[PDB]
Design a protein around this ligand. Structure first.
Ligand code: HEM
Ligand code: HEM
Lengths: 112, 106, 33, 379, 43, 48, 62
């Protein structure tokens, strides 16, 4: 119980960035997040429905330019990115919300 | 005939290097160089290690400048450790260009 | 590219009906056995 | 791309030199003078256009006109004093700008330094003509003495001074000409400033350390837009502090006397921004020698790029040059002092030494100090 | 013209009115300082 | 000589009051905007 | 618990930029008046009786 007791404490939310630059690597990975609800919450299904909209995308999606989520269409259309996925990471006292995109060195800002 | 003078000359040098911001900054004399065409080509010729190092030290430097803080006394660049690592590379580049210029006289 | 240094990777192919079945889809895409 | 406002309009992309551009991280407060320099040009411009909305350019009126702008017109008083004081700022700011590229090796950007130099000397002409517009004792006599200083040229000079004046003295002719040129130089200057910025956008801004910062680059928008706004805040503070509490203080000239061509302030002198040049000019006995020397004071600037001796474009890591650098500024301060001084023994002898010390510091001392430092580092 | 009109668009318009509505208020405030209506001053 | 200046002096007092509030406010905004640059940590970690 | 003054302010007025600007417009108004009032008074105090406002009496309506 004590061991459980240590568990379940809130974990302080911090909005900071960690930028580890390695020009050696061919592509760029970016994971951008806004803290979210615990596992149980009415807001927590509605979020999902939200990310349904933005969606997720890869070099190999068959729809590309006609896909109904703008980030996808733009991406598909303008060769903006390689692959991108929105996520909802759900923890008891914490949550990571955002998406994640892999994109050439010169397209990091446009996809952002 | 430089015996006393050499030692005296050496003594003068330590003070300038210690006195210079570069020693305080933690960026070795070679990173303070004016990046021009020859330096530029010597830079490009650097090894991943040597080269990435210059990038971090200038990174850490320009970060301190931005904050106006000096590095701790313990972590400074000591004159006795003069890595003239650019020198080697930089020399040739010039050497090669001097030659080229000279070959163009007639 | 994923490093294949240890005893962990066994990958070898052999299924019942399907063998080397490649699938392409808009939602997804892959290579199986 | 689709609906990325910025790159959509081609025109709007051109403006992302403010928002997205690579900006060095580390970066003294000194840099804020570029931006501030441009705030000053815009300020001067709006002010000028409102002043020139109620000014006249004739012998008879000019004086009156200015006098009318400061009395019966609504908020023309501050507009005018803002104007006058502004130009002081404009110069204070310009000389910080030049100091920063004299110190940090920004002048390495040859192209950009030659446009600067053009900028500096354009702004000099505008300030020279605008001070005479009012047509007050100081103005009147100052434009006679300076212009006539041109008549030192042997073959032409003489004819030429009379062309510029549009007569044998400085009567109406000359005063309307200044009004026209003053009004159109700042508009030509604005294109040069943008040509200046153009070149400078090809290599980005140098830093304290003197080293490339491509390894540590910041978005201009997030950071620098606030810094700039803040720098304006202080800039305006000084402008208004000047213009609201001590209107005249920095405007040495007390000559609010309508010009009388026989009358003379025995103490004739350009405003503070020109003193240096003035002092350097008086040090030479011969007229022509002075004019050349006058020119060289200012024109000497383009030669510094060639004069650079060191391997560290940054003065930051070089003591001895930091020491002579400062002296030259304090020598400069010394020379500005001579400018408001009776031209008598005490000041003469001082000025002369100052004038040689200025040229030494620029032409011989620093260059050597550069070498020495390089040899101490074993470079 | 015709293309812009749509059944779907209404939420954006509603949202715009508030931001637009908020924006509209600012102008009245902005205009008023310059206008200096005695009645406005009286308000 | 300076009828406007007497009126101007009052504005100066207001300006001085305005400047302090403004000067202080501007610095705070600058710090918040420039806060991120100061906060960031830079380190080098090669496998070597 | 309650929101700090700022958090209250925040959620009422600064989430939506529409409300934020509305605020500012309003604020700019209200502010101008009190500044003046207060700033003026301060200034007049420092020159008591030196200004016409103080002196109008002497030659006014007999
Ligand atoms: C940055 C460039 C400029 C500088 C350095 C400058 C400077 C000056 C100076 C120093 C004076 C003398 C004022 C005095 O002491 O009484 C003056 C006056 C004047 N300037 Fe400018 N000015 C500039 C731009 C302009 C522009 C763009 C205009 C019009 C579009 C203009 C119009 C005038 C007028 C009409 C006067 C005469 C009224 C007065 O005496 O204030 N100036 N200017
Ligand atoms: C009308 C006057 C001028 C205006 C409006 C102006 C404008 C600017 C601006 C906005 C910048 C970028 C930010 C900065 O570095 O501060 C800059 C940089 C620069 N300006 Fe000026 N400028 C003026 C006069 C001059 C003069 C008189 C010189 C030198 C002769 C000069 C030389 C430079 C140089 C060399 C830089 C680049 C330094 C660096 O960032 O490493 N400018 N200018």
């Amino acid at each position: 119980d004590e061991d459980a007791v240590p568990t379940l404490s809130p974990c302080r939310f911090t909005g900071s960035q960690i930028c580890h630059r390695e020009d050696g690597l061919p592509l760029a990975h970016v994971a951008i997040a806004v803290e979210g609800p615990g596992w149980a919450h009415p807001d927590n299904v509605a979020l999902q429905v939200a990310n349904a909209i933005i969606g997720h995308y890869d070099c190999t999606y068959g729809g590309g330019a006609h896909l109904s989520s703008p980030l996808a269409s733009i991406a598909a259309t303008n060769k903006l990115c390689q692959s991108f996925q929105t996520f909802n990471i759900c923890y008891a006292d914490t949550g990571l919300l955002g998406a994640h995109f892999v994109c050439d060195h010169m397209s990091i800002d446009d996809m952002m | 005939a430089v015996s006393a003078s050499s030692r005296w000359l050496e003594g003068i040098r330590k003070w300038y290097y210690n006195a210079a911001g570069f020693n305080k900054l933690g960026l070795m004399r070679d990173d303070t160089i004016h990046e021009n065409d020859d330096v530029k080509e010597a830079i490009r010729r650097l090894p991943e290690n040597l080269y990435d190092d210059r990038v971090f030290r200038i990174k850490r430097a320009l970060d301190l400048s931005m904050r106006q803080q000096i590095l701790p006394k313990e972590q400074w660049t000591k004159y006795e450790e003069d890595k003239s690592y650019l020198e080697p590379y930089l020399k040739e580049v010039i050497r090669e260009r001097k030659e080229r210029e000279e070959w163009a006289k007639k | 590219k994923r490093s294949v240094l240890c005893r962990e990777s066994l990958r070898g192919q052999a299924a019942g009906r399907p063998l080397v079945a490649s699938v392409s889809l808009n939602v997804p895409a892959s290579v199986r056995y | 791309m689709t609906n990325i406002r910025k790159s959509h309009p081609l025109m709007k992309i051109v403006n992302n030199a403010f928002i997205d551009l690579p900006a060095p991280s580390n970066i003294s407060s000194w840099w804020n003078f570029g931006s501030l320099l441009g705030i000053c040009l815009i300020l001067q411009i709006l002010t000028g256009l409102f002043l020139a909305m109620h000014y006249t350019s004739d012998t008879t009126t000019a004086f009156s006109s200015v006098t009318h702008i400061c009395r019966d017109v609504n908020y023309g008083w501050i507009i005018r004093y803002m104007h006058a004081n502004g130009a002081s700022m404009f110069f204070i700011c310009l000389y910080m700008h030049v100091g920063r590229g004299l110190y940090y090796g920004s002048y390495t950007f040859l192209e950009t330094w030659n446009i600067g130099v053009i900028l500096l000397l354009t702004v000099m002409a505008t300030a020279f003509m605008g001070y005479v517009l009012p047509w007050g004792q100081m103005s009147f006599w100052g434009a006679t003495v300076i212009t006539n200083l041109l008549s030192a040229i042997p073959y032409i000079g003489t004819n030429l001074v009379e062309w510029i004046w549009g007569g044998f003295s400085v009567d109406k002719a000359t005063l309307t000409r200044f009004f026209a040129f003053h009004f159109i130089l700042p508009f030509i200057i604005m294109a040069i400033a943008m040509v200046h910025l153009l070149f400078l956008h090809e290599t980005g801004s140098n830093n304290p350390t003197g080293i490339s910062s491509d390894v540590d680059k910041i978005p201009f928008h997030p950071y620098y837009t606030i810094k700039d706004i803040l720098g304006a805040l202080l800039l305006i503070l000084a402008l208004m502090l000047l213009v609201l509490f001590a209107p005249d203080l920095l405007g040495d000239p007390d000559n609010y006397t309508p010009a009388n061509p026989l009358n003379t302030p025995p103490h004739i002198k350009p405003e503070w921004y020109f003193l240096f040049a003035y002092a350097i000019l008086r040090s030479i006995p011969n007229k022509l020698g002075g004019v050349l020397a006058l020119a060289f004071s200012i024109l000497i600037l383009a030669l510094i790029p060639l004069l650079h001796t060191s391997k560290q474009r940054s003065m930051m890591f070089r003591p001895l040059s930091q020491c002579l650098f400062w002296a030259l500024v304090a020598d400069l301060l010394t020379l500005t002092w001579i400018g408001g001084q009776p031209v008598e023994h005490p000041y003469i002898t001082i000025g002369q030494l100052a004038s040689v010390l200025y040229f030494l510091l620029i032409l011989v001392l620093m260059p050597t100090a550069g070498t020495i430092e390089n040899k101490l580092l074993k470079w | 013209l015709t293309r812009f009109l749509g059944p779907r668009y209404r939420q954006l318009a509603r949202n715009w009115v508030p931001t637009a509505s908020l924006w509209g208020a600012v102008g009245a405030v902005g205009l008023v300082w310059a206008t200096d209506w005695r009645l406005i001053l009286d308000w | 000589a300076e009828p406007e200046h007497d009126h101007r002096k009052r504005m100066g007092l207001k300006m001085l009051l305005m400047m302090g509030l403004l000067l202080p406010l501007v610095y705070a905004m600058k710090r918040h905007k420039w806060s991120v640059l100061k906060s960031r940590k830079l380190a080098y970690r090669p496998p070597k | 618990v309650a929101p700090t003054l700022t958090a209250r302010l925040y959620s009422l007025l600064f989430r939506r930029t529409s409300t934020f600007a509305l605020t500012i417009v309003v604020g700019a108004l209200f502010f101008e008046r009190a500044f003046d009032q207060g700033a003026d008074a301060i200034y007049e105090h420092i020159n008591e009786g030196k200004l016409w406002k103080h002196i109008k009496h002497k030659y006014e309506n007999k």
